[PDB]
Design an enzyme around this catalytic site. Structure first.
Site, PDB file in Angstrom:
ATOM      1  N   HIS A  22      35.773  16.582 -25.179  1.00  0.00           N
ATOM      2  CA  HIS A  22      35.861  15.670 -26.247  1.00  0.00           C
ATOM      3  C   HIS A  22      34.601  14.500 -26.200  1.00  0.00           C
ATOM      4  O   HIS A  22      34.110  14.057 -27.070  1.00  0.00           O
ATOM      5  CB  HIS A  22      37.044  14.952 -26.641  1.00  0.00           C
ATOM      6  CG  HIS A  22      37.355  14.479 -28.022  1.00  0.00           C
ATOM      7  ND1 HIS A  22      37.125  15.256 -28.916  1.00  0.00           N
ATOM      8  CD2 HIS A  22      37.984  13.386 -28.282  1.00  0.00           C
ATOM      9  CE1 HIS A  22      37.594  14.559 -30.154  1.00  0.00           C
ATOM     10  NE2 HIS A  22      38.305  13.445 -29.745  1.00  0.00           N
ATOM     11  N   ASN A  69      37.983   7.670 -32.306  1.00  0.00           N
ATOM     12  CA  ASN A  69      38.499   7.600 -33.835  1.00  0.00           C
ATOM     13  C   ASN A  69      37.936   6.413 -34.292  1.00  0.00           C
ATOM     14  O   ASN A  69      38.345   6.108 -35.419  1.00  0.00           O
ATOM     15  CB  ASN A  69      40.135   7.420 -33.656  1.00  0.00           C
ATOM     16  CG  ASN A  69      40.801   6.523 -32.944  1.00  0.00           C
ATOM     17  OD1 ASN A  69      40.078   5.582 -32.165  1.00  0.00           O
ATOM     18  ND2 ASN A  69      42.021   6.231 -33.230  1.00  0.00           N
ATOM     19  N   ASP A  94      31.539  17.066 -30.177  1.00  0.00           N
ATOM     20  CA  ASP A  94      32.271  18.312 -30.080  1.00  0.00           C
ATOM     21  C   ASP A  94      32.712  18.978 -31.149  1.00  0.00           C
ATOM     22  O   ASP A  94      33.236  18.447 -31.851  1.00  0.00           O
ATOM     23  CB  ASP A  94      33.289  18.185 -29.051  1.00  0.00           C
ATOM     24  CG  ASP A  94      34.332  16.891 -29.580  1.00  0.00           C
ATOM     25  OD1 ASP A  94      34.061  15.807 -29.829  1.00  0.00           O
ATOM     26  OD2 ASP A  94      35.630  17.248 -29.429  1.00  0.00           O
ATOM     27  N   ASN A 115      37.714  13.139 -35.532  1.00  0.00           N
ATOM     28  CA  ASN A 115      38.276  11.753 -35.719  1.00  0.00           C
ATOM     29  C   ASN A 115      36.842  10.892 -35.745  1.00  0.00           C
ATOM     30  O   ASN A 115      37.035   9.619 -36.006  1.00  0.00           O
ATOM     31  CB  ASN A 115      39.228  11.334 -35.002  1.00  0.00           C
ATOM     32  CG  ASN A 115      40.829  11.700 -35.707  1.00  0.00           C
ATOM     33  OD1 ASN A 115      40.706  11.695 -36.948  1.00  0.00           O
ATOM     34  ND2 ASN A 115      41.649  11.695 -34.938  1.00  0.00           N
TER      35      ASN A 115
HETATM   36 NA    NA Z   1      36.940   3.978 -38.148  1.00  0.00          NA
END
Ligand code: NA
Ligand code: NA
Length: 189
Positions: A22, A69, A94, A115
């Site tokens: 990630h 996120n 990613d 996210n």
């Molecule tokens: Na946000």
């Protein structure tokens, strides 16, 4: 006078995450920083930022420190700070829908609910911006996604992710050098 470019690598902060799939975006911008002898410095908008010049043009490398996120909480304000518009962004992240060893360049999309991209879209109120999707391999199913992205690349796959990181750096260089993003798509996709 040509403007600036801002290359944003997505990831999570901390030593906990620095080697996880990630964090491929962080890994790529770290490589670009080394290529240019550029150092990441704390910036007041929840980011680490490295800067270098290419024939007079300021290039910014950005690692948000917000967690994936919340990435838009860094990107949105940085664009305001630097007077940068979406056309000057390249976001590197990613892609769970692309094999390890491959990259894909695109100018629009919502990344299947990734996210980090979602946060950027939220903050910029647009899904139109250049991106380099770095494949991290498809998961078995939704049940294994989080463990897939929050684990390192396998030993076996490490040479192949090194290859796609290298192609990613080359793609960024090709853009910094003034080639159109559509030409970059044609060259690297
Ligand atoms: Na946000
Ligand atoms: Na610093």
């Amino acid at each position: 006078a040509m403007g600036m470019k801002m290359i944003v690598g997505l990831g999570n902060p901390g030593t906990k995450y620095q080697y996880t799939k990630h964090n491929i975006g962080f890994m790529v911008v770290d490589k670009i920083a080394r290529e240019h002898q550029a150092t990441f410095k704390k910036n007041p908008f929840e980011a680490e930022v490295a800067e270098f010049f290419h024939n007079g043009e300021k290039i910014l490398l950005v690692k948000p420190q917000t967690f994936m996120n919340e990435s838009g909480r860094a990107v949105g304000p940085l664009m305001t700070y630097f007077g940068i518009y979406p056309e000057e962004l390249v976001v590197i992240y990613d892609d769970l829908d692309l094999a390890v060893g491959k990259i894909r360049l695109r100018q629009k999309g919502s990344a299947g609910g990734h996210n980090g991209i979602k946060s950027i879209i939220s903050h910029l109120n647009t899904n139109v911006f250049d991106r380099i999707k770095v494949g991290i391999g498809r998961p078995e199913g939704k049940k294994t996604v989080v463990q897939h992205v929050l684990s390192p690349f396998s030993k076996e796959n490490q040479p192949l992710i090194e290859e796609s990181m290298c192609q990613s750096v080359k793609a960024v260089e090709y853009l910094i050098e003034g080639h159109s993003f559509v030409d970059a798509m044609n060259r690297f996709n």
